[PDB]
Design a protein around this ligand. Sequence first.
Ligand SMILES: *[C@@H]1O[C@H](CO)[C@@H](O[C@@H]2O[C@H](CO)[C@@H](O[C@@H]3O[C@H](CO)[C@@H](O)[C@H](O)[C@@H]3O)[C@H](O)[C@H]2NC(C)=O)[C@H](O)[C@H]1NC(C)=O
Ligand SMILES: *[C@@H]1O[C@H](CO)[C@@H](O[C@@H]2O[C@H](CO)[C@@H](O[C@@H]3O[C@H](CO)[C@@H](O)[C@H](O)[C@@H]3O)[C@H](O)[C@H]2NC(C)=O)[C@H](O)[C@H]1NC(C)=O
Ligand SMILES: *[C@@H]1O[C@H](CO)[C@@H](O[C@@H]2O[C@H](CO)[C@@H](O)[C@H](O)[C@H]2NC(C)=O)[C@H](O)[C@H]1NC(C)=O
Ligand SMILES: *[C@@H]1O[C@H](CO)[C@@H](O[C@@H]2O[C@H](CO)[C@@H](O)[C@H](O)[C@H]2NC(C)=O)[C@H](O)[C@H]1NC(C)=O
Ligand SMILES: *[C@@H]1O[C@H](CO)[C@@H](O[C@@H]2O[C@H](CO)[C@@H](O)[C@H](O)[C@H]2NC(C)=O)[C@H](O)[C@H]1NC(C)=O
Ligand SMILES: *[C@@H]1O[C@H](CO)[C@@H](O[C@@H]2O[C@H](CO)[C@@H](O)[C@H](O)[C@H]2NC(C)=O)[C@H](O)[C@H]1NC(C)=O
Ligand SMILES: *[C@@H]1O[C@H](CO)[C@@H](O[C@@H]2O[C@H](CO)[C@@H](O)[C@H](O)[C@H]2NC(C)=O)[C@H](O)[C@H]1NC(C)=O
Ligand SMILES: *[C@@H]1O[C@H](CO)[C@@H](O[C@@H]2O[C@H](CO)[C@@H](O)[C@H](O)[C@H]2NC(C)=O)[C@H](O)[C@H]1NC(C)=O
Ligand SMILES: *[C@@H]1O[C@H](CO)[C@@H](O)[C@H](O)[C@H]1NC(C)=O
Ligand SMILES: *[C@@H]1O[C@H](CO)[C@@H](O)[C@H](O)[C@H]1NC(C)=O
Ligand SMILES: *[C@@H]1O[C@H](CO)[C@@H](O)[C@H](O)[C@H]1NC(C)=O
Ligand SMILES: *[C@@H]1O[C@H](CO)[C@@H](O)[C@H](O)[C@H]1NC(C)=O
Ligand SMILES: *[C@@H]1O[C@H](CO)[C@@H](O)[C@H](O)[C@H]1NC(C)=O
Ligand SMILES: *[C@@H]1O[C@H](CO)[C@@H](O)[C@H](O)[C@H]1NC(C)=O
Ligand SMILES: *[C@@H]1O[C@H](CO)[C@@H](O)[C@H](O)[C@H]1NC(C)=O
Ligand SMILES: *[C@@H]1O[C@H](CO)[C@@H](O)[C@H](O)[C@H]1NC(C)=O
Lengths: 100, 204, 291, 204, 271
Amino acid sequence: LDPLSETKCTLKSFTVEKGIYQTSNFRVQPTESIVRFPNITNLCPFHEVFNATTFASVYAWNRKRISNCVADYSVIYNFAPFFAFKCYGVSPTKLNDLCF
Amino acid sequence: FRSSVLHSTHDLFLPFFSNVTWFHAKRFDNPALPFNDGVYFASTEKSNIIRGWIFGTTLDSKTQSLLIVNNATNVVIKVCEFQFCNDPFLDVYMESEFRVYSSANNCTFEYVSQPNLREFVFKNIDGYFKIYSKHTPINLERDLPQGFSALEPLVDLPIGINITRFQTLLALHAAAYYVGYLQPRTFLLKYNENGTITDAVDCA
Amino acid sequence: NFNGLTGTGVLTESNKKFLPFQQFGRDIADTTDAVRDPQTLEILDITPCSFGGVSVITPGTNTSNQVAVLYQGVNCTEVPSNVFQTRAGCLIGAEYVNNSYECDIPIGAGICASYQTQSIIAYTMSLGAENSVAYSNNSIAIPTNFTISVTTEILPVSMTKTSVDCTMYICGDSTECSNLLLQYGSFCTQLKRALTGIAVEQDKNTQEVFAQVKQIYKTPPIKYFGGFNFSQILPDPSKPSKRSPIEDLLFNKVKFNGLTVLPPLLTDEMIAQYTSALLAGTITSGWTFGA
Amino acid sequence: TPSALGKLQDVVNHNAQALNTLVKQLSSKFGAISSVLNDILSRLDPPEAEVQIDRLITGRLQSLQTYVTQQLIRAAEIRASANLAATKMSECVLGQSKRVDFCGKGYHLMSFPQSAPHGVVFLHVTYVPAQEKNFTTAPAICHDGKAHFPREGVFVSNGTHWFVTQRNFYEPQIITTDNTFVSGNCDVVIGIVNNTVYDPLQPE
Amino acid sequence: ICGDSTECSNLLLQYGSFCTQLKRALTGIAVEQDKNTQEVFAQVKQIYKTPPIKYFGGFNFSQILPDPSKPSKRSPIEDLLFNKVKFNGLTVLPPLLTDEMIAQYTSALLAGTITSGWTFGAGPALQIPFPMQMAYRFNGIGVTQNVLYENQKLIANQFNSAIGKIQDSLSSTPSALGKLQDVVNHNAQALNTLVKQLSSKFGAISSVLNDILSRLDPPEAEVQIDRLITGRLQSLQTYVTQQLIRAAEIRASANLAATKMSECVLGQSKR
Ligand SMILES: *[C@@H]1O[C@H](CO)[C@@H](O[C@@H]2O[C@H](CO)[C@@H](O[C@@H]3O[C@H](CO)[C@@H](O)[C@H](O)[C@@H]3O)[C@H](O)[C@H]2NC(C)=O)[C@H](O)[C@H]1NC(C)=O
Ligand SMILES: *[C@@H]1O[C@H](CO)[C@@H](O[C@@H]2O[C@H](CO)[C@@H](O[C@@H]3O[C@H](CO)[C@@H](O)[C@H](O)[C@@H]3O)[C@H](O)[C@H]2NC(C)=O)[C@H](O)[C@H]1NC(C)=O
Ligand SMILES: *[C@@H]1O[C@H](CO)[C@@H](O[C@@H]2O[C@H](CO)[C@@H](O)[C@H](O)[C@H]2NC(C)=O)[C@H](O)[C@H]1NC(C)=O
Ligand SMILES: *[C@@H]1O[C@H](CO)[C@@H](O[C@@H]2O[C@H](CO)[C@@H](O)[C@H](O)[C@H]2NC(C)=O)[C@H](O)[C@H]1NC(C)=O
Ligand SMILES: *[C@@H]1O[C@H](CO)[C@@H](O[C@@H]2O[C@H](CO)[C@@H](O)[C@H](O)[C@H]2NC(C)=O)[C@H](O)[C@H]1NC(C)=O
Ligand SMILES: *[C@@H]1O[C@H](CO)[C@@H](O[C@@H]2O[C@H](CO)[C@@H](O)[C@H](O)[C@H]2NC(C)=O)[C@H](O)[C@H]1NC(C)=O
Ligand SMILES: *[C@@H]1O[C@H](CO)[C@@H](O[C@@H]2O[C@H](CO)[C@@H](O)[C@H](O)[C@H]2NC(C)=O)[C@H](O)[C@H]1NC(C)=O
Ligand SMILES: *[C@@H]1O[C@H](CO)[C@@H](O[C@@H]2O[C@H](CO)[C@@H](O)[C@H](O)[C@H]2NC(C)=O)[C@H](O)[C@H]1NC(C)=O
Ligand SMILES: *[C@@H]1O[C@H](CO)[C@@H](O)[C@H](O)[C@H]1NC(C)=O
Ligand SMILES: *[C@@H]1O[C@H](CO)[C@@H](O)[C@H](O)[C@H]1NC(C)=O
Ligand SMILES: *[C@@H]1O[C@H](CO)[C@@H](O)[C@H](O)[C@H]1NC(C)=O
Ligand SMILES: *[C@@H]1O[C@H](CO)[C@@H](O)[C@H](O)[C@H]1NC(C)=O
Ligand SMILES: *[C@@H]1O[C@H](CO)[C@@H](O)[C@H](O)[C@H]1NC(C)=O
Ligand SMILES: *[C@@H]1O[C@H](CO)[C@@H](O)[C@H](O)[C@H]1NC(C)=O
Ligand SMILES: *[C@@H]1O[C@H](CO)[C@@H](O)[C@H](O)[C@H]1NC(C)=O
Ligand SMILES: *[C@@H]1O[C@H](CO)[C@@H](O)[C@H](O)[C@H]1NC(C)=O
């Protein structure tokens, strides 16, 4: 309620005998979430995956390795109407907050 | 960053006054040295002679291997399952050579970023492959002059491959280098007001 | 959260000179106090925002209810009706007066508070009254009178001798728990021996303080010694325990969970008799019986 | 002024709160499920009850160790205080101490002991000077062509006459031979003045 | 122990009043350091002032008396002495008496001891010429009063040459003030030990609470967080015990200094 009340709670008594009693502490935290990572530059080549016209047949599906890059999965909603988007492994939407 | 403080850390350091192998320069002195927990590399080549480093355990296209060729213009760091024979060489013909390896299985990593006593430290721990470097000029006779030259971090790339041996290749058509072995010790580093290390003290 | 480095603090434009590879800055306490932005290469300093035990300056609830707080170690600009910036921290609830008085409630470096016209006020304590000694190479001052002043000094002598049972306090009338206590070694033996040593030490302290006399001296029937009245220190037979009025005031003004309190070896009557013997000796023998 | 006897009140309060805090930690729940043991052995399996109660033993054993350490520190402090009190008894009550501010504020004459709960109170009868008057002084006196110095006292002047009085009490005495010394001539004393020195042997 | 962690804060309440005893012990030391200075320097209640700068009996007190040239109002010896002697919840509290007030107490004691002798220790400060003041001190050690009067010019020269050598003695050889610097050295190294044990590894997967709370199961990681609470609370207990021991040592030293002031400065001692 007031400094006198927490002073009484610290001494565990309803009376005070004219002293300087250490009661509590103080802090401040109005904001957070400042710049974390540097310029995202080396994007993963999702252009030659979702925009490539020449796709191989299902019996001879292509195998393309994606590594050493930043996978901006937000571009999937651009190069395709995301009709049958279904993530069976981790999460459909929670995909940019984890790494492999 | 550290400003005018003394910091002691238990890490793989080169022991002071230890036993370091030297190769006093077609004479190349490449005996396919082994690779312990750390290799300290230093050279005094004339001009762009010692610009090759390979790593790996078995090297017979069965384990991951390293191939760092400077190409006189960049730092071509590529990780793949190369095939190294009993004697690699870089006898160009320009600035092109292929007889170093003969196969490439996966090639899962590539790094081609841009770059007279040159010093290097190659460490592999927790999957990462730490790389340090430092270039300081010398003018006296070739005797590894006494002093202090702190090595700055260069690449620090994560790979995760297994490395137990390493070899150095030179381009052909002085060539002296040093190979030191890092050991688990405890040093006492002194940093200046700008963060530059001035001297170290081996506690053992 | 610079590159994963989590923390909380103020970020100001730093004048440090890092190296191209360095990203963080540490002090001798292995604490990150300087950091660089990952996008822009500008260096920033990390300082702790605010923390300090707020001491509520209270003049006692028996007098009044107004209180004052003291945010120790922080300015008055980072706090959420008088506000004054003392060198010990921001003080809220008391104004600073220029007059200097005696230090009543210690507030910090040279600042003390008191309940005076009411409201709480802070000021610079006065070390004493100014007295210019009129020195001269031929001036002397000789006292023409005197004043017999009886001062009091209070010093503790002994503590309360206590002894605690190890197993009965830790577990208590238990068997499955007492078996695990045996695995802890002889820690129970150390505490008991330490408490017995403390008890015999308090007994020895009482003996060395009060039992300095070899015999017990008593005063003759009270008569006119020299005009001095010792009735305040001499015991009286009309009151039990044979304590003087001063000792009576001293005595008036000043379950077992495995722990017990041991009674003193010398009771309140034996110490009273030792004090009476010391007094009777020092009034009829002076410094002679002590030698 | 209840704060006067605060020295012994603090002792008894520390003796009380040390036992009250020790028994208050008995009802604690250090990383456990319940503070009492009957609700642990009769509710949890023996393989887990021995692990859960072991943390309660360490919490209560640490409380006993802290209690014993604090009691030892307080016993050392009280032993220092009791040694001081015994020395003060022997040097103020059993005699007269010349040590200033040891047996009261002023010139100690005698002291009286008084018994107190877990302590002792001394009554210091001190001699305090007061009501002083300023006078003119001189280091020596030149009467018979030679300097004179007071045996036990000081030389004071009320403006016209000179007298020798006690250093701590005002008692003017006529400067005579049995109250002054004789050493040296009247040339090395800085500030020596003239005055008559009486001699009871000359008229008789 | 926690450092802005809600899970640790609510869990620390189960350890009882261990935090209360540490704060009470640290506050008992704080009020002890202020009482020590009040018993050593705060001897007289009257702030005596030195007369205008002159000579008393040929003795040159320019090295111990305060000079109005410097703003700190400290004597040359005090200046030479002074010229060579918050993070992670650690807050250093300022002493009740500042260095300016301690200098004023010292100046008052000095003006009392050079203009009144030991008379200001038992009561009012009585005027007395410093030549014949030291003459009384010769009579106390068994030397007649006439020796000082016949060697006053020699006593003043030996005194002034000795006081002047004190500056050269305490200036060079910095090991002379080692007894007083070791106190702050021990305090600083104890604070460094207390702040460095925060990054310890008492058995948890990491030293930071965020690296453990985000990795392990919050309801399961309680038994591992408690392993760091005990490691950090025992460090605080060790720090408080060492501080209490050093406080007892400093209290003994301060009582010795108070006896020294009351007997050597406020009077003449035969011990
Ligand atoms: C990360 O990206 C930011 C934003 O693109 C970069 O900041 C920009 O860096 C450039 C190059 O140093 C600065 O210079 C020039 O500014 C003028 C305007 O005055 C502009 O017309 C030029 O095209 C050029 O950008 C630019 O001022 C600066 N802008 C900001 C807002 O900071 C930053 O350099 C990048 N960092 C890395 C390591 O790539
Ligand atoms: C590095 O060494 C090589 C040969 O050992 C030097 O020749 C250059 O080799 C690179 C590839 O290794 C060539 O880049 C290529 O460009 C084509 C487009 O023209 C692109 O489709 C390829 O994927 C590849 O990136 C480069 O053209 C070639 N230079 C010349 C003049 O033929 C090379 O100069 C050395 N230095 C560097 C910085 O590469
Ligand atoms: C460094 O190691 C080499 C060998 O690894 C040492 O050379 C040997 O020296 C001993 C004498 O102590 C000889 O008996 C051996 O025959 C040498 N072996 C070889 C292969 O030459 C060399 O002494 C070591 N140096 C230091 C400073 O320890
Ligand atoms: C640390 O960095 C500072 C800043 O660059 C260096 O100070 C410079 O020193 C040179 C050589 O003495 C001067 O020419 C410059 O004028 C200085 N800079 C400034 C801003 O005055 C300092 O020398 C560096 N420390 C070391 C040990 O090299
Ligand atoms: C010594 O002093 C005490 C009190 O300080 C005297 O006791 C009082 O004596 C008067 C008689 O004049 C009584 O009216 C009071 O009731 C007494 N008070 C107490 C507390 O006993 C005592 O008489 C004095 N001694 C002498 C010899 O006169
Ligand atoms: C200083 O003291 C002397 C000594 O007592 C004073 O002289 C006396 O004066 C009275 C007053 O007439 C005479 O009755 C005495 O016979 C004098 N005695 C002597 C020894 O001379 C003198 O008056 C005092 N002066 C002052 C200024 O107080
Ligand atoms: C009073 O004191 C003065 C000063 O000490 C005496 O004057 C000195 O007398 C001696 C011997 O008579 C001379 O050798 C000195 O040269 C004198 N000094 C001065 C400064 O005059 C004086 O004799 C004393 N007695 C009287 C009656 O005056
Ligand atoms: C006392 O001694 C000092 C030096 O030992 C003399 O010099 C003075 O020194 C102080 C600093 O301690 C300066 O503040 C003064 O300005 C100095 N004075 C002079 C004249 O140089 C000092 O003169 C001596 N005092 C006397 C009265 O002789
Ligand atoms: C896909 O590639 C074509 C060229 O092959 C290009 O014109 C187009 O902008 C790319 N992106 C999309 C979304 O079509
Ligand atoms: C893989 O690395 C380990 C070091 O941890 C080494 O002992 C082992 O021999 C390496 N494997 C091969 C095939 O060399
Ligand atoms: C302080 O306490 C005393 C004793 O209980 C009481 O008589 C007095 O009235 C109190 N002060 C005030 C201002 O009420
Ligand atoms: C604010 O804090 C700084 C830091 O100690 C201090 O120097 C200053 O006097 C304080 N007050 C103001 C008004 O800046
Ligand atoms: C000395 O002081 C006492 C008490 O102050 C007083 O009773 C007495 O009359 C004084 N004597 C003289 C001579 O002034
Ligand atoms: C000594 O004491 C007795 C008894 O009190 C008394 O009668 C006598 O007068 C005293 N002597 C003197 C000189 O006062
Ligand atoms: C004492 O001082 C006063 C005031 O200065 C002065 O009038 C008086 O003469 C002095 N006493 C003596 C004995 O000189
Ligand atoms: C006392 O000091 C004053 C002023 O310095 C001086 O005039 C006088 O001669 C001195 N007296 C003696 C006896 O030295």
